[PDB]
């Protein structure tokens, strides 16, 4: 009850900032996560014994892949924490509870491969879930871990609050399917500009929480350049492995994913920043003005990728 988590002074200050890096000490990540829940939600939101049992089961079900790993899970949860803290009054108790947990669980049991590689491989998961293949699996894994004895962190909620929170988590996890992001952002763009966007409209909330999930999921492009550059390495290690496996299926991969065409990465990064990241953080800042530091940092990093192409580094 009276057991606060505290952080060292540097972490205590820096964790409030969008561009915080959770650092290389794995064993500190669970406490960083609990710290964020206790300040986003309250020291009352979860039975600490259950939360901790939940966190360690979630951690175990992330695999040892270069990018889609436990560190990504906590990095994306930290970004959602920063958005929630900078937008205190815009979200319900249930939404704050649900979204931090959604972020932690959003890539559960990721194998390092796209929905697209699953479909071409003819993976069992692609027969069970025709679209948002991995994202329907990640939600499935979340529910499975919630149903382990001692793991139902939501136990104290009413029957209908419970159904509300699991529906907040399903929509939020599904929304991390980047194929759904494009339409979701275009719809949010029109709604903001025609002035129809209404946060009391549940279907409008859903859209806005989806964009937040995309913004947190991509938050690697909003870090200080040295963090962004080294995380890009990790994402490309997965992309190249997947490119290799495409070749093994007798399919030339897009040059982005082909490890023989590493020279083309920077232009690929430019495209991704221009087509995905900048529009994502632009639309998010229009709707949630205090999220502007994410846009600014993303623009700084776009500028850094332009220097990479030019050969200035
Ligand atoms: O720079 C990146 N950081 C993490 C996220 C990310 C980055 N580059 C990407 C490309 Cl080219 C495609 C799809 C994603 Cl999710 C990408
Ligand atoms: Mg994912
Ligand atoms: Zn992710």
Short mmCIF file of C-alpha atoms and ligand atoms in Angstrom, two decimals:
data_model
loop_
_atom_site.label_atom_id
_atom_site.label_comp_id
_atom_site.label_asym_id
_atom_site.label_seq_id
_atom_site.Cartn_x
_atom_site.Cartn_y
_atom_site.Cartn_z
CA UNK A 1 0.00 0.00 0.00
CA UNK A 2 2.71 2.53 1.12
CA UNK A 3 5.45 0.87 -1.09
CA UNK A 4 6.32 3.53 -3.73
CA UNK A 5 8.89 2.61 -6.38
CA UNK A 6 11.53 5.41 -6.66
CA UNK A 7 14.24 5.89 -9.30
CA UNK A 8 17.70 7.44 -9.09
CA UNK A 9 17.56 11.25 -9.56
CA UNK A 10 18.67 11.23 -13.23
CA UNK A 11 15.95 8.62 -14.13
CA UNK A 12 13.28 10.35 -11.94
CA UNK A 13 13.81 13.57 -14.03
CA UNK A 14 14.52 12.08 -17.50
CA UNK A 15 11.61 9.51 -17.41
CA UNK A 16 9.11 12.44 -17.68
CA UNK A 17 10.62 13.37 -21.08
CA UNK A 18 9.37 11.78 -24.36
CA UNK A 19 13.03 11.00 -25.44
CA UNK A 20 13.96 8.95 -22.29
CA UNK A 21 15.99 5.79 -23.03
CA UNK A 22 15.27 3.03 -20.41
CA UNK A 23 18.98 2.03 -20.56
CA UNK A 24 20.89 -1.30 -20.84
CA UNK A 25 20.08 -2.77 -17.34
CA UNK A 26 17.19 -5.25 -18.08
CA UNK A 27 16.63 -5.85 -14.32
CA UNK A 28 15.59 -2.16 -13.87
CA UNK A 29 12.89 -2.27 -16.62
CA UNK A 30 10.11 -3.92 -14.48
CA UNK A 31 10.56 -1.24 -11.75
CA UNK A 32 10.58 1.53 -14.41
CA UNK A 33 7.25 0.06 -15.67
CA UNK A 34 5.73 -0.13 -12.12
CA UNK A 35 6.99 3.44 -11.41
CA UNK A 36 5.08 4.63 -14.52
CA UNK A 37 1.84 2.74 -13.59
CA UNK A 38 1.90 4.17 -9.98
CA UNK A 39 2.23 7.83 -11.31
CA UNK A 40 -0.15 7.42 -14.37
CA UNK A 41 -2.87 5.56 -12.50
CA UNK A 42 -2.22 5.50 -8.71
CA UNK A 43 -0.55 3.14 -6.17
CA UNK A 44 -4.09 1.54 -5.90
CA UNK A 45 -4.72 0.64 -9.65
CA UNK A 46 -3.21 -2.91 -9.29
CA UNK A 47 -2.40 -5.48 -6.56
CA UNK A 48 1.44 -5.11 -6.69
CA UNK A 49 1.98 -8.94 -6.10
CA UNK A 50 -0.24 -9.60 -9.22
CA UNK A 51 1.26 -6.73 -11.33
CA UNK A 52 4.77 -8.08 -10.72
CA UNK A 53 3.67 -11.67 -11.55
CA UNK A 54 2.00 -10.27 -14.74
CA UNK A 55 5.16 -8.27 -15.78
CA UNK A 56 7.52 -11.28 -15.37
CA UNK A 57 5.14 -13.57 -17.40
CA UNK A 58 4.85 -10.86 -20.12
CA UNK A 59 8.70 -10.54 -20.12
CA UNK A 60 9.10 -14.38 -20.46
CA UNK A 61 6.76 -14.44 -23.54
CA UNK A 62 8.86 -11.86 -25.47
CA UNK A 63 11.58 -13.62 -27.50
CA UNK A 64 15.32 -12.85 -27.89
CA UNK A 65 15.00 -11.01 -31.24
CA UNK A 66 17.02 -7.89 -32.16
CA UNK A 67 14.13 -5.33 -32.09
CA UNK A 68 10.66 -6.82 -31.25
CA UNK A 69 11.79 -7.70 -27.72
CA UNK A 70 11.12 -6.94 -24.03
CA UNK A 71 13.07 -3.59 -24.31
CA UNK A 72 10.71 -2.49 -27.16
CA UNK A 73 7.69 -3.42 -24.97
CA UNK A 74 8.88 -1.13 -22.10
CA UNK A 75 10.13 1.61 -24.50
CA UNK A 76 6.62 1.80 -26.13
CA UNK A 77 4.93 1.76 -22.65
CA UNK A 78 7.21 4.66 -21.57
CA UNK A 79 6.10 6.70 -24.65
CA UNK A 80 2.39 6.06 -23.74
CA UNK A 81 3.28 7.17 -20.11
CA UNK A 82 4.76 10.49 -21.41
CA UNK A 83 1.66 11.11 -23.63
CA UNK A 84 -0.73 10.31 -20.70
CA UNK A 85 1.23 12.56 -18.23
CA UNK A 86 1.28 15.54 -20.72
CA UNK A 87 -2.56 15.05 -21.32
CA UNK A 88 -3.66 14.34 -17.68
CA UNK A 89 -7.40 15.24 -17.90
CA UNK A 90 -8.18 13.82 -21.43
CA UNK A 91 -8.23 10.08 -20.39
CA UNK A 92 -10.33 7.87 -18.03
CA UNK A 93 -8.88 5.77 -15.13
CA UNK A 94 -9.63 2.59 -17.21
CA UNK A 95 -7.91 4.06 -20.35
CA UNK A 96 -4.70 4.86 -18.36
CA UNK A 97 -4.74 1.31 -16.76
CA UNK A 98 -5.55 -0.37 -20.12
CA UNK A 99 -3.19 1.54 -22.46
CA UNK A 100 0.01 1.08 -20.35
CA UNK A 101 -0.75 -2.69 -20.24
CA UNK A 102 -1.69 -2.73 -23.98
CA UNK A 103 1.73 -1.16 -24.82
CA UNK A 104 3.68 -3.68 -22.63
CA UNK A 105 1.79 -6.61 -24.31
CA UNK A 106 1.50 -5.15 -27.86
CA UNK A 107 4.28 -7.37 -29.44
CA UNK A 108 3.99 -10.49 -27.17
CA UNK A 109 5.75 -13.57 -28.68
CA UNK A 110 6.87 -11.63 -31.84
CA UNK A 111 9.23 -13.87 -33.90
CA UNK A 112 10.88 -10.93 -35.77
CA UNK A 113 8.82 -11.38 -39.02
CA UNK A 114 6.10 -9.24 -40.74
CA UNK A 115 2.45 -10.33 -41.26
CA UNK A 116 3.54 -10.42 -44.97
CA UNK A 117 6.29 -13.09 -44.35
CA UNK A 118 3.79 -15.20 -42.27
CA UNK A 119 1.34 -15.17 -45.25
CA UNK A 120 4.03 -16.13 -47.84
CA UNK A 121 5.44 -18.83 -45.50
CA UNK A 122 1.84 -20.10 -45.04
CA UNK A 123 2.33 -19.96 -41.24
CA UNK A 124 -0.53 -21.53 -39.19
CA UNK A 125 -1.15 -18.06 -37.58
CA UNK A 126 -2.04 -16.67 -41.11
CA UNK A 127 -4.88 -19.31 -41.54
CA UNK A 128 -6.24 -18.50 -38.01
CA UNK A 129 -6.08 -14.64 -38.55
CA UNK A 130 -6.31 -13.36 -42.19
CA UNK A 131 -5.47 -9.68 -41.31
CA UNK A 132 -3.46 -8.06 -38.49
CA UNK A 133 -2.05 -11.63 -38.11
CA UNK A 134 0.62 -10.99 -35.43
CA UNK A 135 -1.48 -8.31 -33.70
CA UNK A 136 -4.41 -10.80 -33.20
CA UNK A 137 -1.81 -13.26 -31.77
CA UNK A 138 -0.30 -10.58 -29.40
CA UNK A 139 -3.84 -9.87 -28.06
CA UNK A 140 -4.44 -13.67 -27.70
CA UNK A 141 -1.18 -13.99 -25.71
CA UNK A 142 -2.24 -11.01 -23.48
CA UNK A 143 -5.59 -12.70 -22.60
CA UNK A 144 -3.78 -16.10 -21.97
CA UNK A 145 -1.34 -14.44 -19.47
CA UNK A 146 -4.28 -12.56 -17.77
CA UNK A 147 -5.95 -16.03 -17.24
CA UNK A 148 -2.92 -17.55 -15.41
CA UNK A 149 -3.65 -18.06 -11.66
CA UNK A 150 -2.41 -15.00 -9.70
CA UNK A 151 -2.06 -12.92 -12.95
CA UNK A 152 -5.51 -11.21 -13.28
CA UNK A 153 -4.33 -7.63 -12.42
CA UNK A 154 -7.91 -6.41 -13.32
CA UNK A 155 -9.66 -8.73 -10.70
CA UNK A 156 -10.93 -5.71 -8.60
CA UNK A 157 -12.77 -4.16 -11.64
CA UNK A 158 -16.55 -4.80 -12.10
CA UNK A 159 -17.77 -7.26 -14.79
CA UNK A 160 -18.45 -4.38 -17.30
CA UNK A 161 -15.30 -2.30 -16.47
CA UNK A 162 -13.33 -5.56 -17.15
CA UNK A 163 -15.02 -5.99 -20.60
CA UNK A 164 -14.38 -2.25 -21.30
CA UNK A 165 -10.62 -2.56 -20.45
CA UNK A 166 -10.06 -5.79 -22.52
CA UNK A 167 -11.84 -4.02 -25.46
CA UNK A 168 -9.56 -0.91 -24.97
CA UNK A 169 -6.56 -3.35 -25.09
CA UNK A 170 -7.80 -5.33 -28.17
CA UNK A 171 -8.42 -2.13 -30.22
CA UNK A 172 -5.07 -0.63 -29.01
CA UNK A 173 -3.04 -3.79 -29.91
CA UNK A 174 -4.85 -4.26 -33.28
CA UNK A 175 -4.06 -0.56 -34.06
CA UNK A 176 -0.27 -1.30 -33.97
CA UNK A 177 -0.86 -3.08 -37.36
CA UNK A 178 0.81 -0.37 -39.51
CA UNK A 179 -1.42 -1.41 -42.53
CA UNK A 180 -4.41 0.02 -40.52
CA UNK A 181 -2.53 3.24 -39.50
CA UNK A 182 -2.72 4.99 -42.97
CA UNK A 183 -6.55 4.99 -43.17
CA UNK A 184 -6.86 5.70 -39.40
CA UNK A 185 -4.66 8.85 -39.71
CA UNK A 186 -6.38 10.09 -42.96
CA UNK A 187 -9.79 9.78 -41.19
CA UNK A 188 -8.40 11.68 -38.14
CA UNK A 189 -6.90 14.33 -40.50
CA UNK A 190 -10.33 15.03 -42.20
CA UNK A 191 -12.19 14.98 -38.81
CA UNK A 192 -9.76 17.58 -37.25
CA UNK A 193 -9.87 19.93 -40.35
CA UNK A 194 -13.70 19.77 -40.93
CA UNK A 195 -13.92 20.30 -37.09
CA UNK A 196 -16.09 17.13 -36.63
CA UNK A 197 -13.50 15.41 -34.31
CA UNK A 198 -15.40 14.84 -31.00
CA UNK A 199 -13.56 13.07 -28.12
CA UNK A 200 -16.97 12.12 -26.47
CA UNK A 201 -17.70 10.03 -29.65
CA UNK A 202 -16.41 6.53 -28.63
CA UNK A 203 -15.49 5.67 -32.32
CA UNK A 204 -13.44 8.96 -32.42
CA UNK A 205 -11.69 8.05 -29.11
CA UNK A 206 -10.89 4.60 -30.62
CA UNK A 207 -9.28 6.35 -33.68
CA UNK A 208 -7.26 8.76 -31.44
CA UNK A 209 -6.05 5.91 -29.11
CA UNK A 210 -5.05 4.00 -32.32
CA UNK A 211 -2.88 6.97 -33.46
CA UNK A 212 -1.31 7.20 -29.91
CA UNK A 213 -0.44 3.41 -30.22
CA UNK A 214 1.17 4.03 -33.66
CA UNK A 215 3.03 7.06 -32.15
CA UNK A 216 4.32 5.00 -29.14
CA UNK A 217 5.09 1.95 -31.35
CA UNK A 218 7.29 4.14 -33.67
CA UNK A 219 8.82 6.22 -30.77
CA UNK A 220 12.32 4.87 -31.74
CA UNK A 221 12.25 7.65 -34.47
CA UNK A 222 11.71 10.32 -31.71
CA UNK A 223 14.81 9.61 -29.57
CA UNK A 224 18.07 11.59 -29.52
CA UNK A 225 20.05 10.77 -32.71
CA UNK A 226 22.59 8.38 -31.07
CA UNK A 227 19.65 6.24 -29.63
CA UNK A 228 17.64 6.46 -32.94
CA UNK A 229 20.70 5.46 -35.06
CA UNK A 230 21.59 2.41 -32.84
CA UNK A 231 17.90 1.26 -32.61
CA UNK A 232 17.66 1.50 -36.48
CA UNK A 233 20.49 -1.15 -36.56
CA UNK A 234 18.26 -3.48 -34.49
CA UNK A 235 15.16 -2.99 -36.69
CA UNK A 236 17.32 -3.59 -39.85
CA UNK A 237 18.83 -6.82 -38.30
CA UNK A 238 15.21 -8.15 -38.27
CA UNK A 239 14.47 -6.74 -41.78
CA UNK A 240 17.57 -8.46 -43.29
CA UNK A 241 16.82 -11.85 -41.54
CA UNK A 242 13.28 -11.63 -43.03
CA UNK A 243 14.80 -10.72 -46.46
CA UNK A 244 17.04 -13.84 -46.18
CA UNK A 245 13.94 -16.01 -45.41
CA UNK A 246 12.06 -14.47 -48.40
CA UNK A 247 15.06 -15.58 -50.62
CA UNK A 248 14.79 -19.10 -49.07
CA UNK A 249 11.07 -19.14 -50.18
CA UNK A 250 12.31 -18.15 -53.74
CA UNK A 251 11.14 -14.48 -53.44
CA UNK A 252 13.47 -11.46 -53.95
CA UNK A 253 12.78 -9.11 -51.01
CA UNK A 254 12.17 -5.33 -51.35
CA UNK A 255 15.73 -3.84 -51.37
CA UNK A 256 15.11 -2.28 -47.88
CA UNK A 257 15.03 -5.87 -46.46
CA UNK A 258 17.90 -7.21 -48.74
CA UNK A 259 21.23 -7.28 -46.83
CA UNK A 260 23.13 -7.14 -50.19
CA UNK A 261 21.56 -3.64 -50.79
CA UNK A 262 22.51 -1.91 -47.47
CA UNK A 263 23.54 1.20 -49.54
CA UNK A 264 19.74 1.84 -50.09
CA UNK A 265 18.82 1.93 -46.32
CA UNK A 266 19.12 5.76 -45.84
CA UNK A 267 16.68 6.53 -48.77
CA UNK A 268 14.34 3.83 -47.33
CA UNK A 269 14.55 5.64 -43.93
CA UNK A 270 13.71 9.02 -45.63
CA UNK A 271 10.62 7.41 -47.24
CA UNK A 272 9.50 5.89 -43.90
CA UNK A 273 9.97 9.30 -42.10
CA UNK A 274 8.12 11.20 -44.91
CA UNK A 275 5.34 8.57 -45.61
CA UNK A 276 4.72 7.34 -41.98
CA UNK A 277 6.47 8.99 -38.96
CA UNK A 278 6.17 12.76 -39.79
CA UNK A 279 2.48 12.49 -40.83
CA UNK A 280 1.81 10.30 -37.71
CA UNK A 281 3.35 12.81 -35.21
CA UNK A 282 1.94 15.84 -37.21
CA UNK A 283 -1.67 14.52 -36.96
CA UNK A 284 -1.03 13.53 -33.26
CA UNK A 285 0.24 17.08 -32.33
CA UNK A 286 -2.84 18.66 -34.09
CA UNK A 287 -5.16 16.49 -31.88
CA UNK A 288 -2.97 16.45 -28.66
CA UNK A 289 -0.94 19.70 -28.64
CA UNK A 290 1.34 18.71 -25.69
CA UNK A 291 2.78 15.73 -27.77
CA UNK A 292 4.72 18.29 -29.94
CA UNK A 293 8.19 17.21 -28.63
CA UNK A 294 7.69 13.85 -30.50
CA UNK A 295 7.17 15.75 -33.83
CA UNK A 296 10.16 18.07 -33.18
CA UNK A 297 12.45 15.08 -32.30
CA UNK A 298 11.19 13.11 -35.36
CA UNK A 299 11.97 16.17 -37.58
CA UNK A 300 15.50 16.44 -36.00
CA UNK A 301 16.10 12.72 -36.80
CA UNK A 302 14.75 13.11 -40.37
CA UNK A 303 17.34 15.92 -40.71
CA UNK A 304 20.03 13.50 -39.34
CA UNK A 305 19.06 10.84 -42.00
CA UNK A 306 19.33 13.55 -44.75
CA UNK A 307 22.97 14.15 -43.51
CA UNK A 308 23.63 10.32 -43.69
CA UNK A 309 22.56 10.28 -47.44
CA UNK A 310 24.57 13.46 -48.21
CA UNK A 311 27.64 11.64 -46.73
CA UNK A 312 28.09 14.32 -43.95
CA UNK A 313 27.90 11.24 -41.59
O1 LIG B 1 13.89 3.94 -38.03
C1 LIG B 1 13.04 3.16 -37.65
N1 LIG B 1 12.85 2.91 -36.32
C2 LIG B 1 11.82 2.00 -35.84
C3 LIG B 1 10.59 1.88 -36.77
C4 LIG B 1 11.02 1.87 -38.21
C5 LIG B 1 12.18 2.48 -38.62
N2 LIG B 1 12.32 2.33 -39.98
C6 LIG B 1 11.24 1.62 -40.45
C7 LIG B 1 10.89 1.23 -41.73
CL1 LIG B 1 11.98 1.65 -43.05
C8 LIG B 1 9.70 0.50 -41.92
C9 LIG B 1 8.85 0.16 -40.84
C10 LIG B 1 9.20 0.58 -39.57
CL2 LIG B 1 8.18 0.19 -38.20
C11 LIG B 1 10.40 1.31 -39.35
MG1 LIG B 2 3.77 -5.27 -33.69
ZN1 LIG B 3 5.90 -2.76 -31.60
#
